[PDB]
Write a protein that binds this ligand. Structure first.
Ligand SMILES: [Mn+2]
Ligand SMILES: [Mn+2]
Ligand SMILES: [Mn+2]
Ligand SMILES: [Mn+2]
Ligand SMILES: [Mn+2]
Ligand SMILES: [Mn+2]
Ligand SMILES: [Mn+2]
Ligand SMILES: [Mn+2]
Lengths: 419, 419, 419, 419
């Protein structure tokens, strides 16, 4: 991932913003976890998308005046003492090389800069990234910053740049797609490794261990999200994360997981039989889902209404359910299939972007993940691919992952130590 | 960990609080990570220590009036929709069973309870757990709550119960020490597994993968802290976490890691030769550090001033450094050893409790971690044990971990595939 | 009053609001009175006019997006315990039937809806009913709400819908006029009852009781405002409410009062001799006022500047005063007549709507209430009618109430038990 | 009520407050009702009890320093314009005469007095009347005042004087009791008036009108609380206020109402048969309730725990219910009797004062109000007397009200036009 990518993102962002306005983005800090410990730092995707900087506590500013456009970074100064504890923070020159932003100055001059901007330069329009997902959320640095601006500069108009950046993230470039592909690749390897080691009478976490191992030893530092490794009746809980039950012989195992490469996410659901063999009933239910996957993936092309995806998924899932006698009428389905089939994928696993009235266009990456959940039969199945919308159709980024009942049983037979 | 342990914690806590006072503790929730994702929930250690409840969103209350003492829990009501996404939350009866608290009610009655406590019952003294580590920190649910109490009940005196509970956590019971013991035990297995798989020309993270595997397969859901796996020059950064450099032949490998069992933490530092053989120079520096370990461990017993540990450590390290020729005078040491030698250990890896004027006493668990860091030689060494203070001395909780140069070289010969 | 009425109110309201905006109205709750008691709940007239709902604590919401328009109500869930104290609150179905609003959901989902509205749907323009009559007023739930919106969604623009709804309330429909007519009708009955029971040497409140009785026994739950029942010198205080003096023989009695029907208000002032016979002097002053009432009512018609009413009232009052000898020049009138002659009438007694530059138009209901107040003679007289502005003139909604000196003396002779 | 009464109230209050402290009480103002209308002003009882001033917008201040004690009143200055609308506000001399407070100054000097108090005199301890009954209540003038003091004078300790005054109000003097007696007297007259006019096939409000009439024409300006006039099944809803149903022949009618004299409250519940005859079944239930009344009133005397009243009430209601076969065991009572039997009475209807661990003492006025409510039989009966606790027993303040079934049937036969 090279500076040119980020520079172009800024060009595009610039074109969405009014003239005579300033925009500020904050890298953020890792939140407190417990005692003196903090959580692992997670780069703010919008900030990162715009600056290419993956470190805390940097600040980015974009001034738009007349025909001019001025971008600036504020980084930390070096601290010889802290370097013996945590290593060196990004340097002036590194920051410029990475971000492609020419003007890189220090945080200690941010306050004075604020003073000039809002007084000397009579700026009237400020944009911040105002992501606020909860009505009763608690105050964040950003919101606090907005409150401050409101009090010192009550005449300044505040706008939200969040939506502006999200709508750009919706359309992936080729190098973005390449990284996702790599993430998927490693996820496949992880899954295959699970398939090669799975057996009955084995703890769910013993299997999770194998997936984690494959990712870790290939250099992947993070997962896309928390691994779902659910066997038997547990696969009925959508985001089951306990992963601490014993896998019974005859149990189906649902995997929902993904590696993360350079801050891009893969997202795969995969269901297989623990003992290497699908039961007659499991084979039925699995193929109904798998149909819904193929059918739904099929209709993907520019011009299609996003809402059509789940509509079709529900149609196909209902036909399969009837055929098999699980239900009589379409309405009963919500008892066995109670989520949406698709979501954007990118810098975030449930990537950003509006869905309302969304129409599919070239460049979008979305997931397709139909599933069926039968509590009384202790069967949970979900199968999920990551699809790229192309110029005149789609490309299945995760097609290399074998999905057919025959292919799975065969693979576990050749490769699984204890089958 | 059985409810009697938490009931007793509450009994001791009660004795530290004034009469005519109410205390409230909050379980909290997982902080925002990115987009719709949150971090993994980490039980608030104080809240956990007092209630034994490891779920979010619960509230605890302790009324102390006259001769009375009334404990209450507020839990979430069940939600048939969310149960299909995340599973059931603790039930009315389970909470009672776990915490030993008799009166358990629901959150939707918390507000009305507030109104009565502060109006009808004329309560004037409220205690909150006010952990505030940063002067320019951002507002938290608790601080917000205090603010609200200040505005609605200005006459109510607010006190901080944080210090009360930390001082209790300083003294571990037998059942506490048993869990720490288990945590160390797995850590050991982890380390051994690293020792048996290590070789030259191998990625740091490849070795981390092996440690992670051992823990995960044994059911351990979390680490104590972010594993440090630093080779050659990298061992010189105290909290080096990149774990993404190649291990050179002749390199030394510094491990600083620990498993966590039922929320209690192990914390071990271990240093070994990648190729299974210490070089002369390395053997020297190692033993110097080893000595400091045994020496400083030696003097541990109730009555000893905490400050004394680091004094002795510095003294013994300096002597080793002189004899070897690394330094001339004691003052130069700080160039090669620039941290404390000890810290409390417990529900937090850097456990709670004041250090100022601290004297050791039966019941404390602490670490001893002398090290030497020689930048110009690309040598970093740290050796760390978890010591328990007994009634007339100490007990080294991690004595089973082999430390001698001979023991290590011998072990890697017998067990390491590629030596 | 049927749902079509309110439905049309909302259609009109919609046409005054910009596109891409949301509007929220709160029913409110009764204010604290003393100890655990609250005042009688008074439906917020704007909220009522829009929803047709007379209960507390409901919330109304109107989204205007693209060509779409979505109306939603939030109501209280039923509570089997409270139903034993206060009775059932409006039900899901009743609310729909009354308001004509199809979507009716519960308050416990209001917060989540807020989150979605202001995050997911990127709403930028919010309208609230911001009636704020006092510069140093105290914070209200609505202002507290705006403050919250401002802190969480600093980019959101806040508009005031109060003016929008008031201007709609200014033009009454036929159904509205009818209700006003009913309210006036009862007021008449109440007045006649007073006339038939009045005598000298009687407590002002004794007469009040007779008027209250007529209204209550006729089903009327509330008065328009606080009954004014002023005898002798007391009629000189414009809003005299004590109502606790003894009516002297020879005293005139000024009645200012009005029944309220279905939340619409009547408003009538009526003066008469306690002993059933006007004195010469009283006949003079009464006729001066009655002249102003007729003359000022006479000029009412679409096109007329509202400011003209009081100009003419003054003119005519001064004419009567000159003729009788009370004053020499027009300027002296302010000593005897010191209020406006007219105000709007409707869901509020001093109904809403601007007066600056106002021109009369069909549909408006206004009052005409000239008076004279002569302190040194202990005479205070006011006669007030409720006028409807019609297509080409006016209609006196209270013409049935007899006003002539001879008509009153005669009525009291025939009907007053002690004359 | 003469000034000496309020003067003694302040003397007692003074003895409950620490030395070196200042106390401020606010008269308040009438809250906004609708548009330009405000609710009727209701003197804040604590303020009233301390000052004897029933006007709004006054401020009272008590300085306690060394051996000194300085009381001050701040009143409004006269406004010649407003006097023509609302009348004269309390004058400098009237204020002194009414309150017994010697130093009376004007509001326009309140602010400067605040400065001197909190700067020049170094006052550290401030008491306010901090009644706050709702955890999520809205900011009040007093809370805003507190907040202000907190911002300008952060060192100043704020205490709540509410409890202090409430405990004084709990013990009534002889002149207080007299007034309550008067309120009760009128209430009785009003009830009898209702008995004399009640018949079947008559609107509930038609009866309420009769009760209001008696009160109004006797000079009573306010009701204790909202008249409850519940017939048939409606008597089942404890605070039924609609009062708009038709009384069916055979219906029992439940009155719960009370006159207010000079701010003191009566509170009576009276049940009778609409047609003048108790049915067998009604006679049964009525007598059970009336027993509970006599029995519970009986045990009242200094030394008796307040909690005993309800315990005995339940005990005696159960016996009656068993005897009649309405229930089998005591537990079933909650189905038909679901409230407390007693509450303090005074300047408030549910008068102030703590109940927890309360022991009855001479001077206390409390109500006794057993009831039975049978939904399936459409029968709701409550009977309530106001009791005074005397030196060695109790005095029934409302004994003159006839309660026996024969007494009532007789009274209605004698006096009721239509029986
Ligand atoms: Mn997934
Ligand atoms: Mn997914
Ligand atoms: Mn360590
Ligand atoms: Mn350590
Ligand atoms: Mn009027
Ligand atoms: Mn008027
Ligand atoms: Mn009552
Ligand atoms: Mn009562």
């Amino acid at each position: 991932m090279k500076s040119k990518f980020f520079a172009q993102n800024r060009e595009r962002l610039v074109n969405t913003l009014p003239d005579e306005s300033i925009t500020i983005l904050f890298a953020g800090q890792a939140p407190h976890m417990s005692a003196d410990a903090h959580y692992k730092f997670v780069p703010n995707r919008n900030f990162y998308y715009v600056t290419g900087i993956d470190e805390p506590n940097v600040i980015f500013m974009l001034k738009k005046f007349g025909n001019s456009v001025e971008e600036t970074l504020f980084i930390e100064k070096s601290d010889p003492v802290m370097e013996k504890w945590v290593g060196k923070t990004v340097s002036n020159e590194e920051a410029e090389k990475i971000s492609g932003i020419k003007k890189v100055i220090y945080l200690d001059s941010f306050e004075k800069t604020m003073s000039n901007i809002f007084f000397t330069e009579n700026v009237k329009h400020l944009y911040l990234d105002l992501e606020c997902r909860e009505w009763k959320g608690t105050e964040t640095k950003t919101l606090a910053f907005a409150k401050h601006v409101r009090e010192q500069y009550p005449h300044v108009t505040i706008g939200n740049v969040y939506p502006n950046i999200c709508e750009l993230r919706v359309f992936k470039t080729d190098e973005e797609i390449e990284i996702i592909k790599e993430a998927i690749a490693v996820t496949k390897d992880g899954i295959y490794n699970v398939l090669k080691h799975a057996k009955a009478d084995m703890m769910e976490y013993e299997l999770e261990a194998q997936f984690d191992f494959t990712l870790k030893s290939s250099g992947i530092k993070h997962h896309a999200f928390n691994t779902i490794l659910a066997s038997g009746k547990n696969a009925t809980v959508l985001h089951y994360e306990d992963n601490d039950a014993q896998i019974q012989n005859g149990d189906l195992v649902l995997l929902d997981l993904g590696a993360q490469k350079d801050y891009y996410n893969a997202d795969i659901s995969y269901t297989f039989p623990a003992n290497g063999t699908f039961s007659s009933r499991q084979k039925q239910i699995y193929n109904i889902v798998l149909n819904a996957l193929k059918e739904t993936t099929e209709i993907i092309k520019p011009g299609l209404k996003f809402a059509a995806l789940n509509e079709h998924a529900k149609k196909v899932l209902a036909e399969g359910c009837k055929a098999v006698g699980l239900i009589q009428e379409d309405e009963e389905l919500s008892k066995y299939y109670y989520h949406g089939v698709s979501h954007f994928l990118g810098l975030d696993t449930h990537d950003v972007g509006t869905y309302k009235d969304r129409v599919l266009e070239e460049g979008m990456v979305i997931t397709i993940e139909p599933g069926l959940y039968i509590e009384e039969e202790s069967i949970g199945i979900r199968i999920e691919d990551d699809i790229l919308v192309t110029k005149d159709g789609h490309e299945n980024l995760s097609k290399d992952i074998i999905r057919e009942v025959e292919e799975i049983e065969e693979f576990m037979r050749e490769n699984n130590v204890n089958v």
